[PDB]
Ligand binder design. Structure first.
Ligand SMILES: CCCCCCCCCCCCCCCC(=O)OC[C@H](COP(=O)(O)OP(=O)(O)OC[C@H]1O[C@@H](n2ccc(N)nc2=O)[C@H](O)[C@@H]1O)OC(=O)CCCCCCCCCCCCCCC
Length: 444
């Protein structure tokens, strides 16, 4: 079996069960992060899509400044997306940016250096973003898809559901930390957001081009020290067709002997992944797909509030799901295909991951969409648990993930375009007439 061989031959870093901690809620993740910031003695590397200027973001940044204040020799770095940091939300009131905020924070803390870098994966945000996940603190990585804001940290009443794994592993964290240092920190495109005279994009357009071309080769290189019959972790990083992550995602699915479970908050599977699923289904195996309700998509705008064009995305992601469910309705009937809609009032959904049987767990920022396949800098940690040492945590986590879901029993239980609000419905129909929906899909 060529797929199983790929996995068997992946380099693997030995992992102690006692150096792996699951957390099951945003608040716990927040507290853990604050716990580790205060405790860190060597380094703190925060890579995130963004670090918002809200109570959540402030909480984390204040704690970083405080850590550096009490340990000047501490190596503290924040890396966020260059483009995202220099704008407000799409279709919101143009405002003070996070980058401006980063500048005020430096000014307001004169003695203490917490460099905030901005990482452009492409010259336009829409064609590439920093989707590298990981908070690297000393010998450990607190790993999550979460960015740093109110909802992701559950600062107040609303939350955004992600996953949270802390892994103490000297070798892995070193590999991840050094990679970030070598391939991002010093690198053409990367500029400091905590500087009022930071450049604009026209000046670095060619720096970004060469940066992307070097990241096209983005990979980790390390010797394996663990065999395929012991708990291990395999850090994976990638961008584009050369991504080892994407190839590992590809080969994982067919390795399922019983069941595959997939999480994504943006359901838009590349054809090659859909074929994997169909294969599994045709072999009598089970496939579980846990996606958010459109109302739990962070692009969703309620009927109440004025409609904005970006608010059409969750509808498109649902169209994708309904089309996918309609094709495979037989397997829903046989109870092999289980599609779960997640919804918890107006809380939002951001879960990623793959589970292959009870043996592999992929924790990743990868949303298994065209964005991750072609555009964005993605990473992951692949946990191999052959002796089932993490079974209590795996089972507990999935139990909690599934709690606020309902199983789709037929595809027509999902709304069709006809049922959508008049402005959305109209917009979407026009896009489908002139096949623009097929085009936009590639950046979704
Ligand atoms: C009214 C004006 C109309 C004009 C529209 C054109 C404007 C385009 C320029 C901006 C392009 C943004 C690209 C973002 C890609 C990204 O973050 O990709 C990664 C992301 C998943 O990252 P993950 O780590 O999983 O985390 P999140 O899910 O929290 O990431 C969501 C990001 O999106 C931001 N956001 C969310 C809601 C909102 N209203 N505005 C925001 O800025 C958040 O602040 C955050 O940065 O994957 C995605 O986000 C998947 C969707 C990609 C969007 C594709 C480009 C924009 C749509 C296309 C234009 C046509 C309109 C639609 C017509 C049907």
């Amino acid at each position: 079996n060529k797929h199983q061989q790929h996995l068997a031959q992946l380099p693997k870093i030995s992992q102690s069960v006692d150096d792996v901690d699951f957390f099951y809620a945003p608040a716990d993740f927040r507290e853990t992060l604050l716990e580790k910031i205060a405790s860190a003695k060597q380094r703190i590397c925060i890579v995130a899509l963004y670090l918002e200027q809200d109570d959540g973001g402030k909480g984390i940044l204040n704690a970083l400044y405080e850590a550096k204040r009490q340990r000047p020799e501490l190596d503290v770095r924040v890396l966020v997306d260059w483009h995202r940091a220099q704008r407000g939300r799409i279709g919101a009131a143009a405002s003070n940016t996070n980058a401006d905020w980063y500048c005020r924070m430096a000014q307001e803390n004169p003695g203490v250096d917490v460099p905030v870098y901005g990482v452009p994966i492409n010259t336009r945000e829409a064609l590439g973003v920093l989707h590298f996940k990981g908070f690297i603190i000393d010998d450990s990585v607190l790993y999550s898809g979460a960015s740093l804001n109110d909802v992701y940290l559950h600062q107040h009443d609303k939350y955004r559901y992600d996953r949270y794994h802390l892994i103490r592993n000297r070798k892995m964290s070193d590999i991840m930390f050094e990679w970030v240092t070598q391939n991002i920190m010093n690198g053409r495109g990367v500029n400091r957001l905590d500087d009022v005279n930071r450049p604009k994009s026209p000046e670095i357009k060619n720096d970004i081009r060469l940066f992307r071309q070097e990241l096209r080769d983005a990979a980790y290189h390390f010797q394996g020290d663990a065999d395929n019959d012991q708990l291990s972790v395999t850090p994976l990083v990638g961008l584009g067709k050369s991504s080892l992550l994407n190839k590992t995602i590809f080969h994982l699915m067919p390795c399922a002997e019983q069941k595959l479970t997939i999480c994504t908050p943006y359901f838009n599977l590349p054809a090659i992944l859909v074929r994997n699923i169909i294969q599994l289904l045709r072999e009598g195996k089970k496939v579980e797909i846990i996606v958010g309700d459109k109302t739990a998509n962070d692009f969703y705008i309620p009927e109440d509030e004025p409609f904005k064009i970006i608010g059409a995305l969750p509808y498109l992601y649902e169209i994708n799901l309904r089309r996918f469910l309609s094709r495979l309705q037989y397997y829903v009937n046989t109870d092999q295909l289980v599609v779960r809609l997640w919804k918890d009032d107006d809380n939002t959904y951001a879960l990623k991951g793959m589970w292959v049987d009870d043996k592999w767990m992929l924790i990743t920022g990868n949303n298994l969409n065209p964005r991750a396949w072609r555009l964005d800098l993605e990473n992951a940690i692949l946990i191999h648990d052959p002796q089932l040492e993490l079974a209590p945590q795996r089972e507990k986590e999935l139990e909690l993930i599934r709690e606020h879901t309902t199983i789709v029993k037929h595809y027509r239980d999902l709304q069709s375009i006809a049922d959508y609000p008049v402005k959305v419905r109209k917009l979407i129909r026009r896009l489908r007439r002139i096949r623009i929906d097929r085009l936009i899909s590639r950046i979704l």
